[PDB]
Structure formats: structure tokens, C-alpha cells
Design an enzyme around this catalytic site. Structure first.
Site, PDB file in Angstrom:
ATOM      1  N   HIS A  79      -1.910   4.842  -3.568  1.00 40.57           N
ATOM      2  CA  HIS A  79      -1.151   4.833  -4.754  1.00 40.57           C
ATOM      3  C   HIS A  79      -1.345   7.087  -4.306  1.00 40.57           C
ATOM      4  O   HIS A  79      -1.890   7.514  -5.723  1.00 40.57           O
ATOM      5  CB  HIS A  79      -2.028   4.989  -5.449  1.00 40.57           C
ATOM      6  CG  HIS A  79      -1.066   3.404  -6.496  1.00 40.57           C
ATOM      7  ND1 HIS A  79      -1.970   2.633  -6.646  1.00 40.57           N
ATOM      8  CD2 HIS A  79       0.333   3.033  -6.540  1.00 40.57           C
ATOM      9  CE1 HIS A  79      -1.518   1.298  -6.668  1.00 40.57           C
ATOM     10  NE2 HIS A  79      -0.273   1.657  -6.590  1.00 40.57           N
ATOM     11  N   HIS A  83       3.381   7.531  -0.940  1.00 39.27           N
ATOM     12  CA  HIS A  83       3.674   6.707  -1.976  1.00 39.27           C
ATOM     13  C   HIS A  83       4.631   7.249  -3.253  1.00 39.27           C
ATOM     14  O   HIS A  83       5.774   6.620  -2.988  1.00 39.27           O
ATOM     15  CB  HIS A  83       2.462   5.743  -2.271  1.00 39.27           C
ATOM     16  CG  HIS A  83       3.197   4.760  -3.675  1.00 39.27           C
ATOM     17  ND1 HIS A  83       3.758   3.624  -3.688  1.00 39.27           N
ATOM     18  CD2 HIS A  83       2.894   4.556  -4.988  1.00 39.27           C
ATOM     19  CE1 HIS A  83       4.171   3.927  -4.572  1.00 39.27           C
ATOM     20  NE2 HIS A  83       4.222   4.346  -6.042  1.00 39.27           N
ATOM     21  N   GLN A 280       1.491 -13.149  -0.764  1.00 42.30           N
ATOM     22  CA  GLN A 280       2.471 -12.586  -0.439  1.00 42.30           C
ATOM     23  C   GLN A 280       4.272 -13.159  -0.920  1.00 42.30           C
ATOM     24  O   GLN A 280       4.733 -12.478  -1.644  1.00 42.30           O
ATOM     25  CB  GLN A 280       2.589 -11.696   0.930  1.00 42.30           C
ATOM     26  CG  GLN A 280       1.320 -10.900   1.322  1.00 42.30           C
ATOM     27  CD  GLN A 280       1.655  -9.299  -0.061  1.00 42.30           C
ATOM     28  OE1 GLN A 280       3.071  -8.951   0.263  1.00 42.30           O
ATOM     29  NE2 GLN A 280       1.074  -9.243  -0.552  1.00 42.30           N
TER      30      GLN A 280
END
Ligand code: P98
Ligand code: MG
Ligand code: ZN
Length: 324
Positions: A79, A83, A280
Site C-alpha cells: 500500500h 501502488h 487467488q
């Protein structure tokens, strides 16, 4: 109570020219900024330039704002600065491939939100700060991090030499601010579900109006999630390594849980390493696929986002089956 850049930090930004050999790459949805850490703030200037034009903002205020943003980002594993620019590059790709659908005001705002949307993120989920028990969750107890991020954006604007929206009327200044707000709040993945649902609804029954302001906000939020999640639309070897940054943050938040004697959910429990490929596939199938599906329905030119999301998906299948 907002960090600012030094004079020299930003003056380096003005001087930066994106290398000729990226003027095509940058234009691709799958484009990976990974290799060019030097260039990221510069990449953002160029993207703003190309889209909005070389006089949309005064050069020096823009460079001071960009570089201060960098500063109010933390050296958390996912983060982080990398990003924010990544998300903003996806929106760039989105706005460029839909050139007449959005207004001057939208385009400049939305690129600015993407840069700001995770401002001063701690690397802990909303779940984590509320459910125990951060000073930031007794201030914003409904989209914790998301009201913080905007709050954050606003302050950076409000410093000296920083308000890149100076030359707007009191009206257009308080219009863009409202595009930005909705945009950032819209990056709260919990909101994303109703919204996508409501847009599939409006699409199917044939009642989606882009003349309608709040239907616009709907489409914009989707564009924002689609941009937040763009890890899933890179090339496979990029996609892998980004998943590596996301999990380290998940897990390190999971580790703070164990340190107070609390089992995290398997998502953040590194001891449950090999359920990732399964995870995922789940995520792709429940969140990502639907996302880029609805978005391509509505803005057909965003379609390679869906294409690359499907390729990644099948890579995970293979990992799951034992063949990657
Ligand atoms: C946008 C990003 C922050 C993100 N949000 C996510 C929300 C959920 C999620 O489930 C995966 C999962 C689920 C269940 C598991 C159970 C066990 C182990 C691992 C497990 N893994 C992945 C998520 N990722 C993500 C997106 C793309 C790449 C990486 C991460
Ligand atoms: Mg966020
Ligand atoms: Zn984000």
C-alpha cells in the site's frame, strides 16, 4: 500535520523527461511500472500532461503536490507509492481509451484521486483497525481508511504553493473535490459489491444513463475498483511478484494478530502458505472477473483488462493443478 517535499525534491521532477522507448509501453493496460522507480513521479506528470494537457496545471505547483504525496505514503510492502502510481496508470489507460466520455474536470480529478487514494495507508485493513482498535477507527468508523485518505488529500491541497486547483471557480473547485471524494470512498472494496450489482441491473434492464450524475458516480467507482485491482491484469511474471507484496502485508497484519493471541483468518496466516493459489482463484472468480466483466460491458474499450485477468486466472489454475 502533513509532510511536505523539499524544494530540490520537486525541482528534480520538472527536469524529468520520460524516455522515448516508453511512449508506447506506457499506453498498454498491462504496463508494469515496477522496473522504473526513479521515473514514477515523472511518469505521473507525463500521464497528466498527455491526457489533460501541458497547461492544465501550473508546472511547479503540480510537481510540489506530486512529490508531497510521495512523502505522505509509507514504506509498507504493498500500500505504498508504487501502488498509487500503478492505480493512476490504469486510470490513465482507461481515460485515454474512452476519450469523449469524461469531462476535463473528471479526467484531472480522477488521476489525482488515484495518486491519493491510499495516502498514508498503514498496511492494515479496515477490519484490523476497527476490530482492534486504532486511533484512526474512533475517528472514521465507516470506511476507516477511505475517509482518512480524502481527509489527507484535502490537507495536501490546502498547503502553500500546493493547491493545484487554484485557477478554478469556487464552483469547479467544489465539484472536483466531490469527484475525488466519491472516487476514494469508492475504493472501499466492501462498497464495490452493491454498486457492481446495481450497474449490472441498470445495464440489463437498459436503464443506464451517463447523463444522470449518480449513474456517473456508479460508473466512476467501478473504474476506481478496476484500477485498484489492476495487479490482476499485469503480465504473469509481474502478477506473481505483486501478489508477493500483497501477502506480506496481509501476513504482517496476521502476525500482529497472533502477537495478541488471536488467530487471523487463513488469508493472513503465513503458516497457511499453499492455500494461496486456491485463494487467488477464489478471488478472481468472486471479485476480479465480475469487476472487469461489468466494466467492459459499459466501457467496451477497457476490454484488455478483462483479457489479461482471464490469462492470470488460468495461470493460477495451472499452479493449483501442478503445471506452472
Ligand atoms: C486487492 C488486493 C488487496 C486483494 N484483496 C483481496 C481480498 C481477498 C483475497 O483472497 C485471496 C485469498 C483468499 C483466501 C485465502 C485463504 C488462504 C490463503 C490465501 C488466501 N488468499 C485476495 C485479495 N487481494 C489480492 C488480489 C490480487 C493479488 C493478491 C491479493
Ligand atoms: Mg485503499
Ligand atoms: Zn489501493
Amino acid at each position: 500535520h502533513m509532510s511536505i517535499c523539499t524544494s530540490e525534491e520537486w525541482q528534480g521532477l520538472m527536469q524529468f523527461t520520460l524516455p522515448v522507448r516508453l511512449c508506447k509501453e506506457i499506453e498498454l493496460f498491462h504496463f508494469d511500472i515496477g522496473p522504473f522507480e526513479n521515473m514514477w513521479p515523472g511518469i505521473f506528470v507525463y500521464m497528466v500532461h498527455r491526457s489533460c494537457g501541458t497547461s492544465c496545471f501550473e508546472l511547479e505547483k503540480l510537481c510540489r503536490f506530486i512529490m508531497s504525496v510521495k512523502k505522505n505514503y509509507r514504506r509498507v510492502p504493498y500500500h505504498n507509492w508504487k501502488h498509487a502510481v500503478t492505480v493512476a496508470h490504469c486510470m490513465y489507460a482507461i481515460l485515454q481509451n474512452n476519450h469523449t466520455l469524461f469531462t476535463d474536470l473528471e479526467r484531472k480529478g480522477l488521476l489525482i484521486a488515484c495518486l491519493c487514494h491510499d495516502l498514508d495507508h498503514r498496511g492494515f485493513s479496515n477490519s484490523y483497525l476497527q476490530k482492534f482498535d486504532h486511533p484512526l477507527a474512533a475517528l472514521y468508523s465507516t470506511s476507516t481508511m477511505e475517509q482518512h485518505h480524502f481527509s489527507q488529500t484535502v490537507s495536501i491541497l490546502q498547503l502553500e504553493g500546493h493547491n493545484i486547483f487554484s485557477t478554478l471557480s469556487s464552483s469547479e473547485y467544489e465539484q472536483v473535490l466531490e469527484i475525488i471524494r466519491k472516487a476514494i470512498i469508492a475504493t472501499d472494496l466492501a462498497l464495490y459489491f452493491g454498486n457492481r450489482k446495481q450497474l449490472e441491473e441498470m445495464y440489463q434492464t437498459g436503464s443506464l444513463n451517463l447523463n444522470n450524475q449518480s449513474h456517473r458516480d456508479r460508473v466512476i467507482g467501478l473504474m476506481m475498483t478496476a484500477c485498484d485491482l489492476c495487479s490482476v491484469t499485469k503480465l504473469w511474471p509481474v502478477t506473481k511478484l505483486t501478489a508477493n507484496d500483497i501477502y506480506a502485508e496481509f501476513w504482517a497484519e496476521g502476525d500482529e494478530m497472533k502477537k495478541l493471541g488471536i488467530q487471523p483468518i487463513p488469508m493472513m496466516d503465513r503458516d497457511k502458505k499453499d492455500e494461496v493459489p486456491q485463494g487467488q482463484l477464489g478471488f478472481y472468480n468472486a471479485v476480479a472477473i465480475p469487476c472487469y466483466t461489468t466494466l467492459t460491458q459499459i466501457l467496451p474499450p477497457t476490454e484488455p483488462l478483462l483479457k489479461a485477468c482471464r490469462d492470470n486466472l488460468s495461470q493460477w489454475e495451472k499452479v493449483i493443478r501442478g503445471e506452472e
